[PDB]
Each structure stands twice: as C-alpha cells, then as structure tokens.
Amino acid sequence: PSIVIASAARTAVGSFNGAFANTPAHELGATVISAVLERAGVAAGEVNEVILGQVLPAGEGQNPARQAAMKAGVPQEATAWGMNQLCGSGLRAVALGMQQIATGDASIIVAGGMESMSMAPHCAHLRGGVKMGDFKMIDTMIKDGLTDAFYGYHMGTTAENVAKQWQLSRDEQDAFAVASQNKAEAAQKDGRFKDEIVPFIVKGRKGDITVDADEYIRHGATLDSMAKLRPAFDKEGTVTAGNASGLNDGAAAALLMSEAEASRRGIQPLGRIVSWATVGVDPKVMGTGPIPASRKALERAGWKIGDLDLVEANEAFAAQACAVNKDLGWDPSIVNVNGGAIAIGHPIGASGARILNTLLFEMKRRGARKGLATLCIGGGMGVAMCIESL
Amino acid sequence: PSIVIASAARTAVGSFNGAFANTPAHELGATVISAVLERAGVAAGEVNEVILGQVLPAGEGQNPARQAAMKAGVPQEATAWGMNQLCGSGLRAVALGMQQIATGDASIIVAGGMESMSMAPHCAHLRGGVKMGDFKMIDTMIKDGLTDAFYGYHMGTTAENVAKQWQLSRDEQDAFAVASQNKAEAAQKDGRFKDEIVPFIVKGRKGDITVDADEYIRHGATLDSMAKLRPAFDKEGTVTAGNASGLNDGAAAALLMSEAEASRRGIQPLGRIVSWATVGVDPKVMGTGPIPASRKALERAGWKIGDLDLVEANEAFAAQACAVNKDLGWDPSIVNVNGGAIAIGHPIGASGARILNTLLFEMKRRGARKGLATLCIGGGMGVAMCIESL
Amino acid sequence: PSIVIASAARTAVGSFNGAFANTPAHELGATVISAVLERAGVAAGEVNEVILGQVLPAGEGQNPARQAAMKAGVPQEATAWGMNQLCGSGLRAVALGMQQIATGDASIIVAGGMESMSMAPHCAHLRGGVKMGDFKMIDTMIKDGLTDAFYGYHMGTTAENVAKQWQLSRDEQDAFAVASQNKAEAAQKDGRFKDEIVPFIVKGRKGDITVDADEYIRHGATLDSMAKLRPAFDKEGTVTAGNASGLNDGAAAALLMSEAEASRRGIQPLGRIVSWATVGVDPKVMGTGPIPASRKALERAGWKIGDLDLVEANEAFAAQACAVNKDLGWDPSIVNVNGGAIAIGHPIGASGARILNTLLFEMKRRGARKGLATLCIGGGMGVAMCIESL
Amino acid sequence: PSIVIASAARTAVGSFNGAFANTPAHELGATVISAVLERAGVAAGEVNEVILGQVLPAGEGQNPARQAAMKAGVPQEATAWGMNQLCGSGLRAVALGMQQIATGDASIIVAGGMESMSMAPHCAHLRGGVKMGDFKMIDTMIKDGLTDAFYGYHMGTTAENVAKQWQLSRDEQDAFAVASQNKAEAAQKDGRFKDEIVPFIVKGRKGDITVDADEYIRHGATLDSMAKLRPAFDKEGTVTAGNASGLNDGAAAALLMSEAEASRRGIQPLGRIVSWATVGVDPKVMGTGPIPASRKALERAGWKIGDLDLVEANEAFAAQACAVNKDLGWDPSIVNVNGGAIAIGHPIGASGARILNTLLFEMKRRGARKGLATLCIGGGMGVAMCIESL
Ligand SMILES: CC(C)(COP(=O)(O)OP(=O)(O)OC[C@H]1O[C@@H](n2cnc3c(N)ncnc32)[C@H](O)[C@@H]1OP(=O)(O)O)[C@@H](O)C(=O)NCCC(=O)NCCS
Ligand SMILES: CC(C)(COP(=O)(O)OP(=O)(O)OC[C@H]1O[C@@H](n2cnc3c(N)ncnc32)[C@H](O)[C@@H]1OP(=O)(O)O)[C@@H](O)C(=O)NCCC(=O)NCCS
After folding, report:
1. Same-domain status, A326 and A264
2. Residue environment code for D174-196, b if the CB has 16+ CB neighbours within 10 A, otherwise e
C-alpha cells in the first residue's frame, strides 16, 4: 500500500499565555482540520476518522479529538480519537492514520496533534479527603507533560545528562540556539511559513484577532543575551531557558489517502510516506531518541543518511539537537533550514505534525525529493518518518 | 496477515473508592502486562510496544502506558503509548495493536486498557488568576469521562434519549439490570472469572491485600431494590443508579502476535482477530453505537449475525443494551452470559479489554467458535471486534 | 477612670492587589505599633497588650496580632489578641483597650485594626473529601468579609435596601461620592494626611518602595464617570463601584494609657475617650447601625448632637452614609471633612482605627473640642465613640 | 462591681472528624448559648452581647459569633463578636464579658468560645494567578491553630522544649496521661459531666443523632499501651499522640451578670469572678504560660496557692501540665479531678470555656469554695481566672 499526504496545515505557534491563552486545543484543531480539507479539495463529509495527538486534555471534556472533528463539520458517522506518545504524538498520529488506510479500514484520515499548554489546569486528587495537613495543587502541564515519571526530574535534566555524555559546551548550545532564532526570523520575514500556516481567529469581546504568525520567534536574538542566562535545571549546568524550547500552544495536521485515491481526485500530494519508526532509549537521555528512530526509519525506507535532501529534527533542547546531529552525521545545512522549536516553540502534542508541516512545505518549495522528520520523546523514545516527493 | 490473541488477563474490577481507591492505573496495568506475558510464555524482553487505553490520566505523570510497561520489566528499547476513544478505548487499543503487526512494524504487542476513576483528580485552569470570587474545581472523571461535550449533559441523559426512542419501560430496564447481577453472581460463584482474573496485590503499611474478585457485583440483587430507586438523570425518567453501570477501576490486556509467530512458539491462542470496526452515531443516542459497529464488523468478517456463538455487548446502561439487543436480533441467551457491566462495573478505558477478556475465556471454556465484542462510546461512536477460535 | 489616646498612626490605605498586594496584615500592623510607640516616646517593653481587629486572618499563622506585636519590638512578656466585629473591629478594639486600663488590668495598650484583603485566600473544606462532582473554592474575602450570613447576599445589597426605605435617588448617591472624592483629593494634596500616615517599606527584590500615599483616592473625579457606571448588585439598582467603598489593605492604631499617666510621661494626648457604644439593628439594613450606635455613645457622654464639632462617619456605601446624615441631623460640613471611605478605602478590620486616626489628627489640626467616630457593621450592628481633645 | 457566673454549659467534645465532623462551630455555639439562657432562667431578649473565642473561622461567613447568637434566638438588637487568643480565647472571652459589665456597658453577657477543627478548610492565595508550577493548599487548622508563627514548628515541639528544661522523662509523661484518661473515664461513667454537658442534635438525612457524651475519652487506658507509641514531633523525643491532647470540636459558655442582678432574679450563680490574668513568655516554651498567669491571678485575688480547693489547668501536653504542677506546688489530687484535655480533647477557641465549665460544676458538687482555671497559649502566653463560690 502507498499512502500520501494530500495536504497539510498548522496554526501559528502561540507563546505561553500569549495569543492562544484562552483558546481550547480542539478549537485550534478544528481550524487545522478545515484547512487540510480546503487545501486538498476534500469535503468534510468524506473524512472517515480524525486522529489527534494530545498530551494535556484535562478539563477539556470528552475526547477533544471528536470535539475538533465535529466543530470542523466532520459528520457524526465518522470517528475520532486522541492519543499520547508525548512529544512524538502529532507525528505518531500520522503513522497511525497511514496504518488505517494500509489495512483497509479507512480511505480518508485527518491526523496530527493539538495542544494548549496555556489552558492545562492545576489538579489534586480529593476523593479520599485530606484529613489533615497541606497538599499540592499540581500543574498538569509540568507533571504530565514535562517531568520524567521514573526519575522525577524535568526534561531539562535529561538534556543536562546528554550535554555531559556528549561534552557539549554552554558556548556550543548557545550558538545553536541563536542560529535557530536567526534562521526562523529569516524564514518568517521571507514568508516561508505562510504556506503552512492557516490563520486562526481568536474571538473575544471587543474584537476578533487574527493570528497568523509564530509569535515565540525572537527577532534580533543576540549571543550576548543567550550567554547571560542562568542555568535553568542544574546550578553548574549548561541548559537554560534560552537554549531550550518553550511552553506553547498550537495544532497541526495532515490529510491522508492512498496514492491511487489522490490520483483519482487529481490531487498533487505533498509527499508519499515511505517509512516510519519508533524506538525506546534510556529515559535519562531521552533526547537521544531520534538517533535509533531515524536509523530504523531510514533502514525501512532503504535509504542511506546521505540520500536525505532535507531534515526536520525537533529541538527540544540545543544539547540534544546537537547530540543527534553529531551521531547521525547528516549535513547540518539541510537540517531545520527554517529554524526549529527553540525559536518556533513546542506545543507538545502538536509538535510532531508541526515539524512535519514545515518539512513538507519546504520540500515542495525547494524541490527536495527525500526528507525525514524526527522527535525525541519523554520517558525515552524517538519517532521518525521518511517522506518522498512525487 | 492473520493476528492472534495469544493470551489475555484482567484485574478484578474495583468499586468506586473501593479496593483500588489509592492505586494508580499504571500499577493495575503493570500487573496485567506481567500476566499476559506469563500466560503466553513470552518474556518481557520480547515485547515491541505497549498500547493502553486510558481516559483519565490527569495527574498520573508522563505517559502512564510507559510507566506500566517499565514497571512490568518491558525494556527501555520498546515503546508505549496511550489512547482515548472513551469507552471504546481498551478494545480499540487491541485493534491498533493488531495493525502494528499487520503492517510489519512490530512482532509482539501488549494492548488493552487501564483506568482509575477513583484516583481521577479535580482541576481548575488558574494561570490567568482569580482576582475575586468563587471558582469551580471540576471533577475530571465527570468532565472528561461522563459528560457529553456537545449537549453538556451526562451519558445518562443519552440513555434516557434511547429509552424514549425505543419505548423501553422502567420495568424492562430493571429486569435487565437484575439479570445482569444474577448472571454475574452465578459466574462469580462458579469460578468463571478465575481464569481471566490476575490477582492484584494492594500494598499497605499495615498489611498487603490480595484483590481477586470483582467487588461491584451485588449478590442477591432483588427486583424490588431496583424498583425502589429514583431516576438519576431525569425526574420523569427511567434510568437509575441501579440500571446503569458504575464508576470503577481496573485494567485489562491482550498479548498479540501473528498466527505464524504463535505456531513457532507452540502457543495455543485464545482467538484469531477476524475483523474490527468503528462507526459514529448521533451523540444524543450514543448508546446505539454498537448497532452500526457490530454490523460493519460482521460484514468485514463475512459473517451473519446468526453465525455468532457468543457476544459481549457492553452494558453502559440497561436502556442502551436493550436497544442494541432488539435491533441486532441476536439470541439474548448468548449475550453477556456471565453478566455485564451493570454488575461488574465500568472502568472506562479498560472496559473494552475487560469484555474482550470475558469473551475469550468463555469462548475457550464452552468451545464457542465465533464471538463478537462491542461497546458504545460517548460522543456517538461504537467499536466492535470479531474473534474466531483456532 | 479616664483613658486618653496618647498617640496614633496608620498606614496609607492601598487599593486591592495594589501597594500591599503581597504584604501580610501583621507586617502593616507592626509598622503601626512601632509608629505609635515612637510618636508618644514610649518604649515597646512598657506595652502590656496589643489588641488588633482583623476579619480575614486565614493562612496567616497563629494569632497574627501577636505577630504584629513581636515584629514591632513588643517583648515576649506582653500579650496580644485579635478580635472580629467586622467593620467596627478596629474601633471596638480601642474601646476594649480603654477597658483593660479602666479595670486595672493594664497600664498601656496598643489597639487598632489591620487587614490584608489582597492576601485573603480561597479555601474549601476538604477533610471529608469530595467523593464525586464539582465543588467551589470560596473567596474568603467575600464569604467571611462581605456576604451576609443570614440572607446570603453582598453588603451593597443591604445598601440597596436602605436606598429603598430612605428613598435615595441614584443622582443623590453620586453627589455624595464625588464630594468625598473631591474632599480627599483636597486633603491629600493639601498635606492633611501626612501626620497620621506612617510610611511603610514594601521590601521588593529589585527595589524597596516607600508607600506613604492613600492610593485608592481618584484624582479629578466628576459626576460623569460616576453616572456612566452600571449598578453592581441589582440590575434596576442604584448602588455602584463608585458610590460604594473599595477592597483595600492597611493598618491603624492608637496608644492608650490613663490620663494621669500621660501627664507623668510628659505626653500631650490626641484625645480622651469619654464614651463608646455598640448596638444591633436588622441585618437587612445593616447601614442603619451608626444611627442607634451614635445616639447611645452620645448619651453615655452626656452630650448632644449639636455639641459635635467633628465627626467621622464611615462610608461603606453612599446610600448608608447619606442615611445616617439625614436621620441624626448633624451638619454635614463637619462630616468627613478630609473625605471618606468611598475615596480612601475600606480596609475592614482596620477601618474603625483608620477613621479614628483621621478624626484625631484633624481635630488636633483645627481645634475641635469634641469628636465622634462611628461605623456600620455587617450582620446589623453599629459602633461609636466620643472624643474630647485636651 | 462584683460579677458572677449565673450559669454555664458546654457541648460534648467531639473527636476529629467524629460526631461533629460536619457541624459548623456557630451551630455548637448556638446550642450552648440557648443552654446558659435556659439554665439561668434568663430570656434571650435580655442579652446585651455574645462574645465567643474562635481560632479557625475561615469560610464560615460573616462573624460566626453573630451567627451563633441569631440562631440561639438572641434578638437583632444585641451585639456579637469573636476573639482570638488561641487556646486562651474561651476563658479570655469570659474575662472580656466581665469587663463589659464592670464598665457599665452591659448588664448581661454570654461569653465563651467555639471551634470546629474538623470543618476548618484548606486555603491558598490565588489572586495573581499561578502561571506555572505546583502550589500549596494550606490546612488552616495546622497553619493557624497549631504552628508557631515565629519558629515555624508544631506546638508539640514547644512541648519537647519544655520537657527538656524540666527533665520530664517519657515514663513520667505517660503516667500523667494514663491517670488523666482514667480520671475522665471515672467522671464519665459516674455522670460527673452530665450537669455541664448540654446534648447536641446532629441533624441528618437518614436520622437525628443526639450527642451528650465526650467521645474522645479512651476507656481502659493503660500505661503499657501509652508506652508503645512513637514520638510524634522529635524522633528521639518523648511527646506522643498518647500524652498530648488531640484535635477536637466543641463549644462552651457562661452567662455573666452582676451579683446584685442575680439576687434580684433569684439565681444561684456558679461562681463570682474574683480575678483574671494574662501574661507572655517565650513561644519556644509556651507551655509554661500558666505559671505566671496563675501566680499573677492569685496575687490579684489576694489568695495563696494553698487556699485553692480546686484547679483546672489545661493539659495541651503532659510535658507542660507536669511542669506547671511542679512549679506551683498545688496538690495534684485537686488538679483536673475529672481528667484533662489529653482525655477530653482540645477544641481550641472553646478549650478555656470548656475547662471553666468543668471546674464550676465540680466546685458546686463537692462544695469547693475557691477555684482557678488556667491554660497555656501558643505564641507564648498564659491565661488564668480565680473563682469563689457564693
Ligand atoms: C525553561 C522554562 C522553565 C522557562 O520558562 P519561562 O518561565 O516561560 O521563561 P522565563 O520568562 O522565566 O525566562 C527567563 C528569561 O529568559 C529569557 N529568554 C528566553 N529565551 C531567550 C533568548 N533567546 N535570549 C534572551 N533571553 C531569553 C526571557 O526573556 C526571560 O527574561 P526575564 O526573566 O528578564 O523577563 C520553560 O520554557 C520550559 O519548561 N522549557 C522546556 C520545555 C520542555 O521541556 N519541553 C519538552 C521537552 S522534551
Ligand atoms: C448513576 C450515578 C450518577 C449514581 O451515583 P452514585 O453516587 O455512585 O450512586 P450510589 O452507587 O451511591 O447509589 C445510591 C444508593 O443506591 C444504592 N444502590 C446502588 N446501586 C443499586 C442497585 N443496583 N440496586 C439497589 N440499590 C442500589 C446504594 O446502596 C446507595 O444507597 P443510599 O440509598 O444509602 O444512597 C453513577 O453511578 C453513574 O454516573 N453511573 C453511570 C456511569 C457512566 O455513565 N459510565 C459511562 C457512561 S457511557
């Protein structure tokens, strides 16, 4: 079976408590489902299932993926579900959507992810009561998204572990971070995020605001400001707020169908999904997940690293992005050519389809034939997907 | 590709704030993962992926499926993820496990579900702040588990909608509820849940407690006690706490591999997965989901309704179970022969795998050749799976 | 036994979440305690007891009055206690101080009120647990400070009740609220609050900040911004944000001792306490209570209403404040000459000391032989006290 | 002047989350207010003011003393307020009431205290919002009731400090504790608490329960079970749950009037208040407070210690109780003859009116002439009162 990505879209990525501060993830997801449909010339009546990665759905109500689908006019007879493989989610959803089509269970899938880190609630288990003494209201964003479940420390600490093992200086991490900002700024000013972004209308009271630019990108980002930051996780460390990605909101998706179906419809697809892989690694160095996952995906495609024309490798932290690049040895000039998540941001459950969006539109723009998208995953995993142009 | 269920297990289903009141879902999952492995003679080192349905993960930390896998000794090099299609989740995870094998991405999967409704927290979005006045702490079990996201009302009200469309008296619903209790009691007393149940040790300061019986089942349940209850959702209604399922905790899973892989290993499998389906319906009558799902599953198998030897159709509410039975027209004497959820309970994300467990072990013990498991799903969906013995 | 207020001091009154947003009451209380000691030339070790009114103590630790006293340098030998007569609490504390001395139980007392409405938390009783469903986190500032415990409604609704019985038009309340603004803007600029205020140092991190101005007074207040406000409590109402007092922070106190003592210490006092009283009235019309309270205080003094040259009468609302003026019949050109609580603020537990400070320093200023300070109290009470300058 | 206690009553003392687990303090207070009215044969319309000690009022609404008063049928024309001197409050309100009569401000007062430690909430300051992170829900029972504001540790730590100074072995403390339990079992079983207890009806959904017995008293308390307990604060220390009082709920009151009034009305009072005293000490050793307070009270009464026929001295902890006794040298056999707070419980704001009740009725039944009630006070204070039978 040959599955293509007929169309794709993403919202702009919102800053923490920024543009999307009070927008539920399923509203972002609904806009992105409408857009992939419009972009492909496929009607919502035609969709069989919607599959959305999402890590932080607490308080949002029954299966936000169904909410997003219904809001986008996807008929009640279709189905929808959410899934959670942490930062891998929005990419793994695409692979799962491909499998629906490959096994003959569906013809048309919309797959990606959505996340509102801003709207994630604080919680406490209160059923058994608290007979005496203080208790914590727990931030679900930190607890369920950002804290290792085995070791009890933030993802930032796994990044420090990688910095130590790979001997990555503060200087090198900072330079990588400044480069991410500067590349993202240039791509933004040149209009290279236009094709991928679908504008999102934030409704208010005193006026609707259209959001169509990635607001987390820092323009004119200096090495000096990066260098002046204090280590954010270890007092004698190297990982800072500047060389780590952010807390962000957004959604991203792809519309999938068979290659034979896109041909019937006269759709020029954004690419054929040639392989995907997911592999585990030690939780303590979770940032290394893209290494075995990329290698396995490439093996499954029958491709050498040198065959790749473009790469999107998620920048959760400069320390891990640098480790991945060192080990794989791919030309860094083809990696995150338009910036990465240090600059763009990291809306967890949407990230994987966010970078897939960026890869597919840049692949189209430059005429690149073979690309790969890859993410590290909390708790020690990687996910990778190989895309070829038709 | 022919995928078999090599082994299966579930915990006892705990009562709300009962035996598992302070046991995290992933601990229940870890025991069920260890058990399917032990029962199949497969080592944890051999597992490629763990896929666990779970609707209420809030506060449990990063990717509870990975937590369960790790605690069960599944290697760091395997992967694990969570998914949510509400009541359908634990069955859908099984079909998703099947698909990983079918597409050559994995050889051995443990799939199912887990849920701790008891441990589900209360929450409030507090990031903007609360400058002045009262705010609501929201019960995530109700909000995210049991309330329709479109109409704002409980799943119970959708049961009333179905009661009214199908003209299902209070007396009919209560008789069905009493029967489910009395069937479950008889199965329990005769030992028919022993094979499917893996005991769970609840670790305690003042002593360990082994839980190996379904504690929600009411022994000696009378019609009069059903008849005395007030409607729980509408005041001229008919759906009560007695003729609905409960709020419950448990986990349930299946170990999957190819039919050829089971042969090599000398495993006598519990069943071959012959087909599965998921379809949507109107959220207002979500309890009718099993009707289209089961019919589509049967069509994919090439079976008639009359070919089934055993059926597990989930009893979210008497009202909907009755409607499903009436429309399908299957012999009621082959449906839920050991009782159903009204008696056994309804640990949401686990339910689909719990009923699968019950199906497979009853199929083995009676020598039934063809079986079907189906559930209704909040927000208007159904899932069904057809199993043949080999 | 004749008792005299040897000295007095008060913080400026802050607005809600403003100057004292993160400053505990007891710290504001300590500044005041020290201020009065210094002002009279009395050593802290000479004080027998600190009596501080305070309505909103939750979270602040054991006996915040004791905390005030110790942080002010009052040694461990002295005693301290808080009390609560809601709005009259800070005047009643002065009466109680007076009482200790005239019973021979003490020689020297510091008495006033303190309040941090800003630091008042949300709370819920959670020892029993909350087995299922949403619950409310309660704003203690509102539940314990501004909600009638009998009927269940806010104090501005008792102001609506007094507006209907005393036939006060919406235009007449705006007239009184601008006139108080004008009068307090006048005072502030004219330097009349300098003496009574003791500066408070809000220890920041990037900067300490000397608060010495009443920052709830609105400069250049007209009838227009007043008469374009929506009724805050009824929909067809006449009470508003601008003709009611504010939510505020602050502390206030007096240094008490016997007449003969003050003469021994070479202290020229601010005034002698000749009488005081508290009376109850209907909780529905709680703003009525300064009428019977002021008559009783006045009769205990052996005075007449026309004998008064200066009067502080607390403006919780402009309907209740206009009502006391109209019934008692005193000349309103001697009533709150430096403005009122609508302008200055309503720091509950401190209010009565506050208005005591203004009366005492203003009396001292102009040469007024006889004072009266009086306050209405939620729950249907009044408090009053008659002062003679020596 | 000469004030007498015309009558007195108290509820039973409830166990933490026991009989009064869901009964508000003012409800207990209301029942004790109605009791002292009834027992004195004085009508509620005659009461000038109600003064109740209360330490943990968060979330009970406006001034819970006015709530106990209005529910007791005290008319709206009276006044009511609460006060807080921690464990002293309940006895201190009595001296406060006596002061109101001595200074001609009232003829008739009801005074004592109330407390529901069970119903004390958890709280957090949430006004600015919590942008990121866990935050604490603070148990006001512990924060505001049981934790020293200066040193930040429990009252039972102050009890360790006292035990160290006085060289009071683990055995000595337990011997005092078991005696106190055994004294109270005896008083309970012989009906010595019947007079002072007024029954309280807990209104409920499935039945009214009448509570008229102290439920905290341990029957059959032995030295050997006392000895089996672990230290509750210091891990090489001596203060245990067995030799410290507990967390309890209750209310207690006395009705005060001049000796001449009581003669007018033919009332036989329960005692003439002869003196009272409060003093401060080091908070580190707050349990020594009763020493200067009782010695100063006795100096004010003109009495020697050996003139006392009966003493109630509060047992917040066996360590401080033993210390107090050793210093004062009074015959232990007249101290807490019906047992003490270790047995009976320690409902904070009510403790002092509680032991005042206990002393009064025992003074009446054995024909004792002279009596003293004293308590230690967190933050380092003592309070005492001398009582002569008429
Ligand atoms: C690191 C983290 C705690 C910082 O979050 P934050 O509180 O919203 O950021 P802060 O406002 O505190 O940042 C501190 C400073 O760094 C600055 N900063 C960030 N990037 C910068 C850059 N490129 N140059 C200069 N300054 C920068 C901010 O402007 C801020 O300045 P200020 O405190 O003087 O106002 C948070 O973003 C985080 O958790 N990141 C990791 C996300 C993650 O783990 N994702 C998944 C991992 S697999
Ligand atoms: C119906 C529901 C709201 C009731 O809430 P609940 O608090 O758990 O109700 P309880 O189990 O305590 O039952 C109430 C009373 O009836 C009794 N009772 C419960 N089940 C009974 C039965 N089957 N027969 C007779 N009596 C019964 C209990 O003993 C209890 O006693 P009480 O009179 O002293 O209160 C809740 O169970 C529910 O939501 N059920 C459906 C869950 C659901 O929707 N799942 C997924 C939907 S697709």
Report:
1. no
2. bbbbbbbbbbbbebbeeebbebb
